[PDB]
Amino acid sequence: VTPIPLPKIDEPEEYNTNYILFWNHVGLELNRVTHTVGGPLTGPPLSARALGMLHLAIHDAYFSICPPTDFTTFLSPDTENAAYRLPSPNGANDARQAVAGAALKMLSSLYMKPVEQPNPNPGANISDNAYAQLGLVLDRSVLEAPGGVDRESASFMFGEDVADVFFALLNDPRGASQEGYHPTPGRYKFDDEPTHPVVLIPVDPNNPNGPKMPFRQYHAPFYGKTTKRFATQSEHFLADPPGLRSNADETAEYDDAVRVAIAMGGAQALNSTKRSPWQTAQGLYWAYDGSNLIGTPPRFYNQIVRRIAVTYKKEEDLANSEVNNADFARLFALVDVACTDAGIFSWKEKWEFEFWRPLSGVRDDGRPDHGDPFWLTLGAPATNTNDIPFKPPFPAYPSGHATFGGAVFQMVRRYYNGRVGTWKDDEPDNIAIDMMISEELNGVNRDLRQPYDPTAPIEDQPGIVRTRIVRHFDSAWELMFENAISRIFLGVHWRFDAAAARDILIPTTTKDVYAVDNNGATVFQNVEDIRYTTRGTREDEEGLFPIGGVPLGIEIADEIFNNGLKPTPPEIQP
Ligand code: VO4
């Protein structure tokens, strides 16, 4: 088959001389390729799960052969429970080959054709071409691997055994099933997107030019409540969103949120849009909304973490440094596991409340002096395509981006504290990064004038090129914040989906009503002054709970870290 020409990644090629980074890279490539061809593990929660599984297998394969001192492996060889029993090296001492076997085995199990019956129902929607393209990626990776891959070595075989264990234990085949789910219309209730109420999908994925059929997607409605958690030691909950349950009386907050939604996230040319050009840039920068050649948010978070890892490595040699190898293997396991669990809990809460998106909220408001029946958002960018595709929708509260970001960046902060600088674990850090480029704004990717052509490189396809923006960030606290508010700029999330409005916005004399500038744009607090302290109530439980995705993510990362990356006790699994 013709290999899809993938655009160049903005990153020092030296990074991939390190075999831990190389395998992470392979995972990211499969991430973007599967979203281009419509293969398995698409969507934010499951794409995160794939990376978590990959790095867990790598972590244990490496630390089995090169034992750590301040922590231990995720699974152990002495576990009585066969499902959690880690294989023993038994002579194998080649860490490079162990990692290769674990990574290759895991990625292959994840992305290859489900010959073992699983093709029915679960995989019955992916074309043969999708699988073929994914295979190409896997095949050339073997050839590009630093130091090569010796599939016959005992160490390689050991890595494979490790992968088998993790795959059998954590794989969730029916994770994205929506069978049986249907929206329950009403105020504050999630339903089909007014701009994309239905999709025409081919009856046969192998014949895309053939007959289509109407389809209504709902992204992983049962995943969060039924899936196996990775390293969390408890269930996490958020306060009821403004307008629902115990907080149904928070009308001032809700009304002002509608107001901020229109002004900050509307389409570019609307007279009601007050968002600045720079804010529009911040919105698109963090998107990665499953587009062609781009993938999902977990991919971007890993791209950023790769830069942090190299920027703050202990030793200069990326190729032959066990200090670096152990550092990266540990960091990525921590980060990708936190990201996986963040996906689980954000999805659990999303479908629990089933809160509607701003587009529907503003349009269906019903009050002549509050709503706008014809409003349009800036929206999730449909990069490298010529239209606005129907992307499987899901509820608004809390923001997936916000939760992912909170988890990933708080994990990075906990890991580097005392090493890059010193700070209170709940206060701004100093982990700065430079020359960070998002593929949404890289001067290469674009909004096509005609349908995407997978046999030609993106540069030879007509369209409006996305401006190349090179960013610098002063801290992981800033990254966390901007990643969260970017969704407000796109108009896909309410302010409270990110965090409590009180913690991120500038207050006025009027309660629940926040400050706007001379031209009506919403004013945010300075990043250095932001503290996620405001909590709220839940109708079904006593106590105070976090509001929005960022606080939820921070909470998940702290828990995992404090427990040193230990499996969720099987007793508390769904
Ligand atoms: O991925 V949101 O849940 O931030 O659209």
Swiss-Prot record:
Keywords: Chloride, Metal-binding, Oxidoreductase, Peroxidase, Secreted, Vanadium. GO terms for molecular function: chloride peroxidase activity; metal ion binding. It holds the Pfam family VCPO_N. PANTHER family: PEROXIDASE-RELATED, PHOSPHATIDIC ACID PHOSPHATASE TYPE 2_HALOPEROXIDASE DOMAIN-CONTAINING PROTEIN. Homotetramer. Catalyzes the oxidation of chloride in the presence of hydrogen peroxide to hypochlorous acid (ClOH), which in turn can react with a nucleophilic acceptor (RH), to form a chlorinated compound. This is Vanadium chloroperoxidase.
